[PDB]
Amino acid sequence: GWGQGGTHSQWNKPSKPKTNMKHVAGAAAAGAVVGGLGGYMLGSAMSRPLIHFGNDYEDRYYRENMYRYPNQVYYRPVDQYNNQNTFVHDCVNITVKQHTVTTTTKGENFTETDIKMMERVVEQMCITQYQRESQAYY
Amino acid sequence: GWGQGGTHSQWNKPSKPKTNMKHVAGAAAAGAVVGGLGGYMLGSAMSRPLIHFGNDYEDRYYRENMYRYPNQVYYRPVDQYNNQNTFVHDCVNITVKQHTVTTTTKGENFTETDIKMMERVVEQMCITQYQRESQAYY
Amino acid sequence: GWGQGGTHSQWNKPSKPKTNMKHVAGAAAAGAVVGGLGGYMLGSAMSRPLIHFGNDYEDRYYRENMYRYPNQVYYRPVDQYNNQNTFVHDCVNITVKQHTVTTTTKGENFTETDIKMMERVVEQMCITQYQRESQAYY
Amino acid sequence: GWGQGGTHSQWNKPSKPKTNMKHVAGAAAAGAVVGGLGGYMLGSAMSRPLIHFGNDYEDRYYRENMYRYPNQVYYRPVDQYNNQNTFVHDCVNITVKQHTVTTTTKGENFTETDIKMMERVVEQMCITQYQRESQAYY
Amino acid sequence: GWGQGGTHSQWNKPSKPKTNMKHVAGAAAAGAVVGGLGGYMLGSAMSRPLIHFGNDYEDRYYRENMYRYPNQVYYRPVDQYNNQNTFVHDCVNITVKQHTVTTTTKGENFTETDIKMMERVVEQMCITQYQRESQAYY
Numbered sequence: 001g002w003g004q005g006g007t008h009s010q011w012n013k014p015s016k017p018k019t020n021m022k023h024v025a026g027a028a029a030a031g032a033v034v035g036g037l038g039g040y041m042l043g044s045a046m047s048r049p050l051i052h053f054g055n056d057y058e059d060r061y062y063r064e065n066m067y068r069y070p071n072q073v074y075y076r077p078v079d080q081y082n083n084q085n086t087f088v089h090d091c092v093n094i095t096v097k098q099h100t101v102t103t104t105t106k107g108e109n110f111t112e113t114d115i116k117m118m119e120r121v122v123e124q125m126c127i128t129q130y131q132r133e134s135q136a137y138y
Numbered sequence: 139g140w141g142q143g144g145t146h147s148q149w150n151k152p153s154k155p156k157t158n159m160k161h162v163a164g165a166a167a168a169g170a171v172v173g174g175l176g177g178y179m180l181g182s183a184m185s186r187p188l189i190h191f192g193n194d195y196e197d198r199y200y201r202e203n204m205y206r207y208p209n210q211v212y213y214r215p216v217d218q219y220n221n222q223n224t225f226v227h228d229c230v231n232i233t234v235k236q237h238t239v240t241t242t243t244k245g246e247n248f249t250e251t252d253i254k255m256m257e258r259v260v261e262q263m264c265i266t267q268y269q270r271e272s273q274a275y276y
Numbered sequence: 277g278w279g280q281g282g283t284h285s286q287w288n289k290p291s292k293p294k295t296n297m298k299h300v301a302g303a304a305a306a307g308a309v310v311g312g313l314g315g316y317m318l319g320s321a322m323s324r325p326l327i328h329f330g331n332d333y334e335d336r337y338y339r340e341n342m343y344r345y346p347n348q349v350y351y352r353p354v355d356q357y358n359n360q361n362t363f364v365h366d367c368v369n370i371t372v373k374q375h376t377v378t379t380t381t382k383g384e385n386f387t388e389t390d391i392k393m394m395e396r397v398v399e400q401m402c403i404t405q406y407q408r409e410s411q412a413y414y
Numbered sequence: 415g416w417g418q419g420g421t422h423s424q425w426n427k428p429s430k431p432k433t434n435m436k437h438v439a440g441a442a443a444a445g446a447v448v449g450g451l452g453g454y455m456l457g458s459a460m461s462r463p464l465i466h467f468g469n470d471y472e473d474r475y476y477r478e479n480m481y482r483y484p485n486q487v488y489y490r491p492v493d494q495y496n497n498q499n500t501f502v503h504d505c506v507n508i509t510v511k512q513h514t515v516t517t518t519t520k521g522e523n524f525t526e527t528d529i530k531m532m533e534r535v536v537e538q539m540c541i542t543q544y545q546r547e548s549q550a551y552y
Numbered sequence: 553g554w555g556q557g558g559t560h561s562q563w564n565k566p567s568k569p570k571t572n573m574k575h576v577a578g579a580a581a582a583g584a585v586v587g588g589l590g591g592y593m594l595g596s597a598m599s600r601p602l603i604h605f606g607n608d609y610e611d612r613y614y615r616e617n618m619y620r621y622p623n624q625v626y627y628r629p630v631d632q633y634n635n636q637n638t639f640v641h642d643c644v645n646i647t648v649k650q651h652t653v654t655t656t657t658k659g660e661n662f663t664e665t666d667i668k669m670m671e672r673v674v675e676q677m678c679i680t681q682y683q684r685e686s687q688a689y690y
């Protein structure tokens with residue numbers, strides 16, 4: 001007539017996490033867990049992987065049992081070329097340019113005029129602005 | 139008639155984490171856990187991996203049992219070429235340029251004019267601004 | 277009729293962590309745990325990895341049991357070429373340039389004019405500003 | 415009828431950590447733990463790794479048991495070339511330049527004018543400013 | 553009918569750590585623990601690694617048990633070339649330059665003018681400023 005108390009356990013219990021950031025790449029933030037017996041595991045081999053939050057009871061009576069390589073993980077990869085990549089390209093290859101090429105041969109009595117006005121061409125770009133009861137003036 | 143008290147345990151219990159940052163790359167922040175028996179594990183091999191928050195009871199009676207290599211991890215990778223990468227490119231390859239190429243051969247009595255006005259061309263770019271009851275004037 | 281008191285234990289218990297930072301790369305900050313039996317483990321091999329927050333009871337009676345290499349970790353990698361990398365490129369390759377190339381051959385009585393006005397071209401860039409009841413004037 | 419008192423233990427218990435910093439690279443800060451039996455462990459091999467916050471009870475009666483290499487870690491890596499790196503590039507390769515190349519051959523009676531005005535071209539860049547009831551004037 | 557008092561122990565218990573710093577590289581600061589049986593351990597091999605905050609009870613009766621190399625760590629790495637590095641590049645390769653190249657051959661009666669105005673070109677850069685009820689005037 002024994003007794004085990006109930007378990008109220010948290011692998012991650014953050015209370016009121018107020019966080020301001022920009023980039024979360026390959027990481028964990030704002031009270032987040034990257035995988036329980038998992039996550040970013042490109043090549044894995046797990047024998048008898050068990051997750052049970054409930055109570056566990058075992059009454060085992062093993063007699064003259066021949067266990068030959070139980071839960072064996074024969075991890076023998078050959079020439080494994082696997083790609084599991086995350087690519088994020090934001091505001092990449094942005095060009096604001098004015099280019100002029102001049103190639104004049106034996107030019108006599110000639111006038112060359114190259115005017116490239118560039119005014120108010122881009123006012124805003126990639127403005128990741130979060131507003132809450134706020135004001136922004138540009 | 140024994141008794142084990144209940145377990146109220148937290149691997150990470152941050153209370154009210156107020157944090158300001160910019161980049162979280164390959165790390166942990168703001169009360170976050172990178173993996174419980176996991177995370178970023180490209181090549182792994184785990185035999186009998188068990189996670190159970192509940193109470194555990196075991197009553198084992200093993201007699202004359204032949205256990206030959208139980209829970210064996212034969213980790214023998216050969217020529218493993220695996221890629222699990224996180225790429226973040228933000229505001230990369232940004233160019234604001236004015237380029238002029240002049241190639242004049244035996245130019246007689248000629249006038250060359252190259253005017254490239256560049257005014258108010260980019261006012262804002264990559265402005266990651268978080269506003270809460272605030273004001274910004276540009 | 278024995279008794280074990282309940283366990284209220286925290287691997288990390290930070291209370292009210294107020295933190296200001298910029299970059300968290302490959303590290304831990306703001307009360308964060310990088311992995312419990314895990315994290316950033318590119319090549320790993322764990323036999324019988326067990327995590328249980330609950331109470332543990334074991335009543336083992338092993339008699340004449342032949343355990344040949346139990347929980348054996350045969351970690352024999354050959355030519356393992358694995359990449360699990362985090363890449364963050366923010367405001368990289370930013371160029372604000374005015375370039376002029378002049379190549380004149382036997383130029384007689386000629387006028388060369390190269391004007392590149394550059395005014396108010398970029399007012400703000402990569403402004404990671406967090407505002408709370410604040411004001412910014414540019 | 416014995417008794418063990420409950421354990422209330424913290425591997426890291428920082429109370430009200432108020433911290434201001436810039437870079438946390440490959441380190442620990444703001445009351446953070448880098449791994450419990452883990453963290454940044456590129457090549458690892460652990461046999462029977464166990465974490466249990468709850469109470470542990472063991473009643474073992476082993477008789478005539480042949481344990482041949484139990485929990486053996488055969489850590490024999492050959493030619494292991496693994497990369498688990500964190501790369502953070504912020505405001506890298508920033509160039510503000512005015513370049514002029516002049517190549518004149520036998521130039522007679524010629525005027526060369528190279529004007530590159532550069533005014534108010536970049537007002538702010540990489541301004542990582544955290545504001546709380548504050549004012550900034552540029 | 554014995555009794556063991558409860559353990560309230562902290563590996564690190566900093567109360568109200570108020571800290572101001574700039575760089576935390578490969579270190580520990582602000583009441584942070586770099587790893588419990590872990591941290592930054594690129595090549596490791598641990599047999600039976602156990603962490604349990606709860607109370608431990610062991611009643612072992614071992615008789616005529618043959619333990620051949622129990623918990624053996626055969627740590628024999630060969631040609632291990634592993635890289636787990638943290639790279640942080642902030643405000644690197646910043647160039648503000650005005651360059652002029654002059655190559656004139658047998659130039660007769662010619663005027664060369666090279667004007668590169670550079671005014672208010674960069675007002676702020678890499679300003680990591682934390683403000684709390686404060687004022688900054690530029």
Ligand SMILES: *[C@@H]1O[C@H](CO)[C@@H](O)[C@H](O)[C@H]1NC(C)=O
Nearest residue numbers: 089090092093094095227231
């Ligand atoms: C455009 O961007 C891609 C990646 O998004 C890059 O690989 C390439 O070199 C760029 N091309 C240009 C700038 O012409």
Ligand SMILES: *[C@@H]1O[C@H](CO)[C@@H](O)[C@H](O)[C@H]1NC(C)=O
Nearest residue numbers: 107108109110111246247248
């Ligand atoms: C061009 O050059 C020739 C030189 O032989 C001259 O006769 C002519 O007047 C020139 N053109 C002008 C518009 O002056």
Ligand SMILES: *[C@@H]1O[C@H](CO)[C@@H](O)[C@H](O)[C@H]1NC(C)=O
Nearest residue numbers: 089092093227230231365369
């Ligand atoms: C453009 O960016 C890519 C990566 O995003 C870089 O590899 C490449 O060299 C860049 N090309 C340019 C600047 O022309």
Ligand SMILES: *[C@@H]1O[C@H](CO)[C@@H](O)[C@H](O)[C@H]1NC(C)=O
Nearest residue numbers: 108109110246247248384385
């Ligand atoms: C160009 O040069 C020739 C020199 O022979 C001259 O006759 C002519 O007047 C010139 N052109 C002008 C517009 O002066």
Ligand SMILES: *[C@@H]1O[C@H](CO)[C@@H](O)[C@H](O)[C@H]1NC(C)=O
Nearest residue numbers: 227230231365368369503507
């Ligand atoms: C552009 O950036 C990439 C990385 O983002 C770098 O490898 C390359 O050399 C750069 N190219 C330029 C500056 O032309």
Ligand SMILES: *[C@@H]1O[C@H](CO)[C@@H](O)[C@H](O)[C@H]1NC(C)=O
Nearest residue numbers: 246247248384385386522523
């Ligand atoms: C150009 O040079 C020649 C020299 O022979 C001269 O005759 C001519 O007047 C020149 N051009 C001008 C516009 O002066």
Ligand SMILES: *[C@@H]1O[C@H](CO)[C@@H](O)[C@H](O)[C@H]1NC(C)=O
Nearest residue numbers: 365368369503506507641645
């Ligand atoms: C651009 O930056 C990369 C790394 O981000 C560096 O390796 C390269 O040499 C740089 N290229 C330039 C400055 O042209």
Ligand SMILES: *[C@@H]1O[C@H](CO)[C@@H](O)[C@H](O)[C@H]1NC(C)=O
Nearest residue numbers: 384385386522523524660661
């Ligand atoms: C150019 O030089 C020649 C010298 O022979 C001269 O005749 C001519 O007047 C010059 N050009 C000017 C505009 O003075």
Ligand SMILES: *[C@@H]1O[C@H](CO)[C@@H](O)[C@H](O)[C@H]1NC(C)=O
Nearest residue numbers: 503506507641644645646647
């Ligand atoms: C640019 O920076 C990289 C590292 O970020 C450095 O290795 C390289 O020499 C630099 N290139 C330049 C200054 O051209």
Ligand SMILES: *[C@@H]1O[C@H](CO)[C@@H](O)[C@H](O)[C@H]1NC(C)=O
Nearest residue numbers: 385522523524659660661662
């Ligand atoms: C250029 O030099 C020659 C010398 O022979 C001269 O005749 C000519 O007047 C010169 N040019 C000017 C504009 O003085």
